[PDB]
Amino acid sequence: AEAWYNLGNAYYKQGDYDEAIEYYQKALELDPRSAEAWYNLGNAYYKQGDYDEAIEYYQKALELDPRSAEAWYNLGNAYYKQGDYDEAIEYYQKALELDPRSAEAWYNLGNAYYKQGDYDEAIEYYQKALELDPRS
Template identity: 45%
Template sequence: MRQILLTFILCLSVVLGTAQNSTLFKQATEFYNKGEYTKAIENYGKILENGEHSAELYFNLGNCHYKLNAIGPSILYYEKALLLKPNDKEILNNLGYAQNMRLDAVEEMPKTEIAQLYLGLVNFLSFDQWAYLAVALSFLFVLAYLAYFFLRPATQKRIAFISCMFSLVLGVLCVLLAYLQFQEFKHDNPAIIYSKEVKISSEPNTNSEAVFTLHEGTKVNVEEEFNDWSKIKIADGQTGWLLNDNLRLLKDF
């Protein structure tokens, strides 16, 4: 009886929480349409505090900060939205506008055509999307196998057999791509510079030499951490250390 009561309370809290978030999102949208971007940000922030994360929520937060000319936060939230909804044209478009406001123009290290093709294929979908596609192809494989087993006409059996093998090969490929994409995701730890300007040091201490300077909105990759310091790498291959307060991680959902 006690377990049933706890389950009921849990379900009720989830329903109430969802309703509250829906109300907050609606109010935030109204604030945004009125040009009250700070109030909209407050409401979106409350939804995040309630534990809800979505591409739409981060996209709207990015729009609000962009309207307030806050480069770092706008890029941060657009990038977060892109992690949850890869290749979304609207997110990419708005992210491009925000990136044009950055002071740093870091050129990426050139990649070979093979590397570009590999990354384009692996990152075409997120690892969970590759996994969902693999599951769908597995169902298709089972259906095609059953069709091959029960059908009598030779032509239909041949089509069923080809479909069976085709879905099996594609399913295995999707599993492989999901694994490769997950490995890429796991080793990639992107962050956005949040300070207006920060000196990047050669060592994790305040007495070390500054090797270069970064500005708000620049995307970096965190390679390791030491106490309150992070070692970062930028797109052109340069590395250095900075205090953690100067950046915000993208994958801290």
Template identity: 45%
Template sequence: MANHQHETPEIPKEVLTDLNQYIKYLRERIFFEPESPVFHYNLGIAYARKGLRAEAISEFKQAIECDPTMAQAYVNLGGLYFQEGELDRCINANRKALEIDPNLPMAYSNLGFAHLQKGEHEEAIEACRKAVELMPQLLQAHNNLAVAYLQVGRHQESIAASLKVLELHADFAPAHYNLYVAYSATGDEAKAAEHLERARELGYPAE
């Protein structure tokens, strides 16, 4: 089922006002130019920003109908499917994006996340490695890579991936926790304890 979240509370009031005006503007433009993939795409982005996933999905689909080569629309569509828990649809959408443009780091990152959630660890590793190869600063892909390596017992590679996460964001709590697990598995109790303490200081995992 689609999750209709109206006006997400994190958006400051003045930003929300601008966003609502932008949505109104785009809807008016689409009324006169219904075949414009760019207007549909931008409206999809705006709806996603507001947390209106079903509306965003509809607009990205319409953008693709207007321009089947719009790879970024597939990437965003896949990301929304992931949020909806529709992992196979997420995978299919991002694969279509990569058929159009094989150099989209976010498409690989989305694929890695979806495969990881499905327990398809080798596919997750392959996708996440490609994502970080294309965009080395993509923190979430490094973190997913660390988790996938942990799941298949490749502890040293997991440690390397988590250390890369901490280079990008020293206080990223899940990376500290992943290091605790990986160092524990390798018998390095001192480093394991150090990272567990830091993860807990940062509130992870939540009690």
């Protein structure tokens, strides 16, 4: 499974998401245990703009490792891309409980509240983001 997974990773890293999906799926047929495998399969679908597929496999990754701030965050992103800002906020919240150091994660939490027209909540999370990284 690991060699198939590494092939998928190499394709993913050069931006060939169709090939990444093929070889990630092969790795999971042999070893469905890896959270990082389901997570990166989700990432591959996300990068294609196949957000329902991304959501399906992010959930699988989270069921195997619910401590994964990265998986919660990317699940948030998939909903944000669908315009589901309520679900985006819910999953960003869980990501930021597990790792509150990511200026990027606070920023996108702010963006999700901004998109709902909740400007004071946007301000709160933008302020946190800029406290960590004041360059953007």
